[PDB]
């Protein structure tokens, strides 16, 4: 989101996999920040979701 | 080749700069895309100095047809890389960026390869001056009273 | 070789003699040759 | 070209400076547009030294028309890039910025390309001196007894 | 060779860059595949200046085939390393990275090796000028009255 | 031109330095305006060394008419930029400031262009020495007994 209300394009990243214990949920290229930014990070699951340590490379 | 339009060239330049691509989550606005298209047109007009500059086959869109973006540029397959690298270099200023060393080197190399063939064609030798004799070795020219080179 | 060869002439950047182009055409109305010194972006013209 | 007015030139210069563009979510200010138009007029008057400078086809506005903005610049399509790059470089100190190396180099290259054709045109040879003989090989000069070159 | 497709070239380039390989835990993303494939096509078309540049045997995909990815590149085994090292160097700025010194040196070495054989082939001596005598030592030409070389 | 007075030049110089303009929320006092006008008059008088220096057509104010500010400077259109750039450079130290590199370069370029035409006109060649014969080829001079060139 660039204004705090509306969220833009939605991209699907495999955040889990059966019987795999090292996945590295990652997105290569995020866009250029104009003024502000926020992230949604929505998940739809039937299995537990554990998430920690979100980070970016702002440069 | 997929880079078929001026919009495609601008998108390639943005992808090179890292500002916008197909994998991004935030994109630049169409007004910014139009401004970049106008900068591409200005750069090509500056290069092609009304026929005495760098010839590439670029087509300058007319204002009668409303959108300049979306018209095929008409460049050959070997000039697209140079053109969009130079475009990225030119439009990096706008976003408070600076084109990286690889981008600048590729831009220089592409411009050089763009002008190589035109330089080879233009490397012409002037004719003999108006004050050279043709020489008596040219018997055929001697028999026709062609004793001096015309010139010009 | 004698005819179709460029003669001995100086190499000039256009900015060096911009505005003094009539001093180098070959006339003898001037006691010296003037050159441009400064540029609005580079401050000073490179010396070579 | 979509750049047809002094306002378009000023907007392009401000975009390149990053002062006011869509990519930065900043709109152009009229108090910053009048100053930039005044600078553009001063720069063009300084360049075109009353006919003995860099000929560009720029159309100088008059005091009769109250708003200087809105008038076509009259520039050829191969001059706009150089002109607005130079304008951005000149008006950066107003906002106490510093035009980046890419903009400075583009302004230099564009100014040189602007003067190239006029330099080629002005590179002319003086006529023969008034004291040189015409030689005995020129049939028309021999007929008219023009033993010496006119000079001047 | 194991590297037989444009996709294999892109995977090798990304692995060398470290963006996505099994050395790390990253997997190649389709949008990172397509952009690099387009970049590779543009770079190869720039190199192969319609036959007057670097010859590699690279097969240029036509628009009729929807996926450019998956088609065989057609390069010889001795060109794959150079091609994918230079591709990694060219697509490094996409992710705002910088190719390492070893990658840059290998790219330079591979490009030189690519052009070596073509340079040897093209280093050809011009024929004899049109104004040479054939010499009286050549009895055949002397009797035939081929006293001078053809030229061109 | 929009700039038509010494105060207009001073305000342009302040705009360049970034001290005050038509959009700033703070301004400088009329005494400071008068001081800047005085510095401009001093610098113009220093340039115009009683006619033996730089000729620009500047009209010096008189004390009978009270306000020096408000008089047309009389400069041509091609001198305004140079004059106010050098004025900004000169009055920068007053406000504990320093003119930037672009302003200094433009000042140098403007002064050079200001003196270019005067230098061209002043580049004159002295007449022949009084001990130089006119030559026997100078028929009219020899007939009128002007055997030697007139001394001066």
């Amino acid at each position: 989101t660039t204004d705090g209300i509306n969220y833009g394009r939605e991209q699907m990243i495999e955040q889990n996999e059966p019987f795999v214990y090292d996945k590295r949920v990652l997105w290569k290229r995020v866009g250029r920040i104009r003024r502000l930014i926020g992230f949604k990070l929505r998940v739809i699951t039937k299995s537990p979701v554990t998430l920690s340590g979100c980070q970016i490379r702002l440069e | 080749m997929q880079i078929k339009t001026k919009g495609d060239l601008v998108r390639a330049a943005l992808r090179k700069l890292g500002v916008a691509s197909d994998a991004t989550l935030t994109d630049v606005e169409p007004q910014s895309m139009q401004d970049a298209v106008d900068d591409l047109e200005a750069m090509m007009a500056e290069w092609y100095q009304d026929g005495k500059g760098i010839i590439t086959g670029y087509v300058f869109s007319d204002d009668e047809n409303p959108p300049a973006e979306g018209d095929d540029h008409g460049l050959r397959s070997s000039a697209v890389s140079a053109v969009f690298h130079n475009l990225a270099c030119r439009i990096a200023p706008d976003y408070a960026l600076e084109a990286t060393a690889k981008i600048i080197a590729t831009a220089k190399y592409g411009k050089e390869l763009l002008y190589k063939q035109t330089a080879i064609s233009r490397a012409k030798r002037a004719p003999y001056p108006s004050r050279m004799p043709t020489g008596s070795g040219n018997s055929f020219a001697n028999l026709n009273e062609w004793h001096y080179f015309p010139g010009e | 070789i004698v005819a179709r060869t460029p003669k001995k002439k100086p190499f000039f950047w256009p900015e060096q003699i911009a505005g003094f182009e009539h001093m180098y055409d070959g006339n003898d109305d001037y006691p010296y040759y003037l050159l441009n010194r400064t540029d609005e972006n580079s401050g000073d013209l490179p010396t070579q």
Side-chain angles (χ1 to χ4, degrees), chain A, chain B, chain C:
Chain A
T1 180
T2 70
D3 46 342
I5 313 171
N6 321 338
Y7 289 80
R9 192 185 73 88
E10 261 215 3
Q11 180 82 62
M12 291 187 255
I13 328 173
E14 303 220 321
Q15 68 102 26
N16 206 330
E17 198 145 281
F19 325 116
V20 201
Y21 310 96
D22 41 358
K23 198 60 172 33
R24 202 205 279 279
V25 195
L26 182 162
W27 193 236
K28 283 329 299 183
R29 325 192 261 166
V30 197
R32 171 218 172 226
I33 298 208
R34 199 157 77 152
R35 212 173 91 259
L36 318 174
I37 218 180
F39 300 100
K40 169 67 75 64
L41 173 48
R42 149 163 87 107
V43 193
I44 285 195
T45 40
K46 279 192 216 170
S47 308
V49 182
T50 311
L51 293 159
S52 41
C54 188
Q55 69 178 223
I56 50 195
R57 173 159 62 91
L58 275 184
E59 290 186 311
Chain B
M1 94 169 204
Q2 308 292 299
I3 317 200
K4 303 200 247 235
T5 53
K6 314 190 197 324
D8 282 71
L9 288 173
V10 163
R11 290 184 268 285
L14 300 190
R15 178 190 75 228
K16 273 321 189 173
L17 284 173
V19 169
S21 73
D22 304 329
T24 168
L25 299 175
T26 84
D27 191 354
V28 311
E29 274 182 318
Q31 174 63 256
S32 292
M33 223 157 263
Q34 182 186 260
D35 290 353
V37 167
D38 286 298
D39 241 86
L40 158 74
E41 294 264 288
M43 176 216 324
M44 309 315 288
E46 171 168 304
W47 284 7
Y48 174 83
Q49 284 262 325
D50 293 317
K52 341 191 73 73
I54 308 183
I55 274 77
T56 41
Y58 196 75
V59 193
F60 302 93
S61 38
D62 54 62
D63 308 296
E64 180 260 311
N65 189 252
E69 175 172 341
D71 290 300
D72 300 18
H73 41 72
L75 305 162
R76 21 192 176 77
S77 212
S78 43
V80 176
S81 156
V83 153
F84 86 75
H85 271 103
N86 283 274
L87 185 49
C89 270
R90 281 245 187 170
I91 75 180
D94 311 45
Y95 319 88
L97 265 83
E98 169 77 61
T100 199
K102 184 59 195 194
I103 287 182
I104 302 175
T106 321
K108 293 150 56 48
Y109 177 73
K111 220 181 143 168
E112 264 263 346
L113 273 47
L114 248 68
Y115 195 67
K116 169 185 291 176
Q117 218 67 31
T118 326
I120 274 147
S121 148
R122 262 148 203 189
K124 251 165 283 183
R125 223 199 210 296
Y128 280 93
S130 39
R131 292 187 280 199
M132 200 86 79
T134 36
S136 39
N138 309 86
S139 304
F140 198 63
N142 253 28
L143 293 182
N144 305 341
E145 303 299 287
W146 183 5
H147 296 318
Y148 279 78
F149 275 106
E152 168 194 89
Chain C
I1 278 174
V2 162
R4 341 180 49 188
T5 300
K7 325 261 164 221
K8 187 186 92 179
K9 273 170 285 185
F11 284 96
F12 279 130
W13 291 336
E15 310 233 278
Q16 274 191 328
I17 57 130
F20 309 112
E21 288 109 337
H22 47 280
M23 281 179 162
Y24 307 90
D25 54 349
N27 52 52
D28 226 343
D29 325 309
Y30 303 96
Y32 36 68
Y33 307 100
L34 303 182
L35 292 183
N36 271 265
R37 160 158 95 79
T38 55
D39 186 14
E40 61 150 42
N41 305 98
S42 97
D44 253 30
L45 261 178
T47 303
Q48 188 239 29

